[PDB]
Design a protein around this ligand. Structure first.
Ligand SMILES: Nc1ncnc2c1ncn2[C@@H]1O[C@H](CSCC[C@H](N)C(=O)O)[C@@H](O)[C@H]1O
Length: 240
């Protein structure tokens, strides 16, 4: 495909391509190309100031009545080694998930924090784990924008049991800035439906990028008007 299937089906392409299989050398090659930029992505989060991992992990435990020790936690391809290392110290002794880049997998798997990690990118297709599997899931830097199509996230929720916790972070408004409010309304519909109930939304640097204290004036010279980086935690299956 081109441009990761319009900056949406990127990962989804991998499941499509991995279906053929029987190509460990090239399958690694494709991932190897992704990992080429990978290091450039790491520094990118620092520039974005994704506090999520710090507050995100803390917030989950604060709202997570169950112990990550006895509960089964889930992490996605965006389960950066450090989040897991912090997760372990946080009190998570049980973790499962899926990741696309071996380098991303190496931190998690080689770390020895994740009980079981699986290679398999996706996005416009269901998550690898089954429903009612893990008591909670925590992914960072993966959303509708070629990485993890926001419709698929709810699949992660599906693999999460009721009363569980789902934690995610990425660019809130990479595009469709007004759609965020539309997006927020969508969560409420799911909450109302009973699928999941929004708990809290942790602060980030997303507001400042789109809106500047000075004003609209010289907007282009201000390099502002786009909201990015935000974290939030939702409960699994709850009433309104
Ligand atoms: N469902 C999924 N399965 C596997 N990998 C996924 C995934 N969703 C996102 N990813 C990961 O997201 C990255 C996109 S391309 C790599 C860029 C950089 N490593 C980064 O962290 O963004 C890959 O590392 C890929 O493994």
């Amino acid at each position: 495909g081109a441009m990761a299937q319009e900056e949406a089906g990127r990962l989804p392409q991998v499941l499509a391509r991995v279906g053929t299989s029987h190509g460990i050398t090239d399958l690694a090659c494709k991932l190897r190309f992704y990992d080429d930029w990978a290091p450039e992505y790491d520094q990118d989060v620092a520039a974005l100031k994704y506090r999520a991992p710090r507050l995100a992990v803390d917030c989950l435990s604060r709202a997570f009545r169950g112990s990550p020790h006895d509960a089964l936690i889930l992490d996605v391809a965006c389960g950066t080694g450090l989040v897991a290392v912090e997760l372990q110290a946080r009190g998570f002794l049980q973790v499962q998930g899926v990741d696309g880049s071996p380098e991303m997998l190496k931190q998690a798997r080689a770390r020895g924090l994740y009980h079981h990690l699986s290679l398999c990118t996706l996005g416009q297709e269901p998550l690898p784990d089954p429903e009612g599997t893990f008591d909670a899931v925590i992914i960072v830097g993966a959303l509708s924008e070629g990485q993890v199509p926001c419709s698929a996230i709810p699949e992660l929720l599906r693999v999460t049991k009721p009363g569980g916790l789902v934690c995610l972070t990425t660019r809130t408004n990479p595009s469709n800035l007004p759609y965020k409010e539309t997006l927020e309304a969508t969560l409420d519909s799911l909450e109302r439906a009973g699928v999941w109930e929004c708990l809290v939304t942790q602060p980030v640097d997303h507001w400042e990028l789109a809106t500047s204290e000075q004003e609209t004036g010289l907007g282009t010279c201000a390099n502002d008007g786009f909201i990015s980086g935000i974290i939030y935690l939702y409960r699994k299956q709850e009433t309104v």
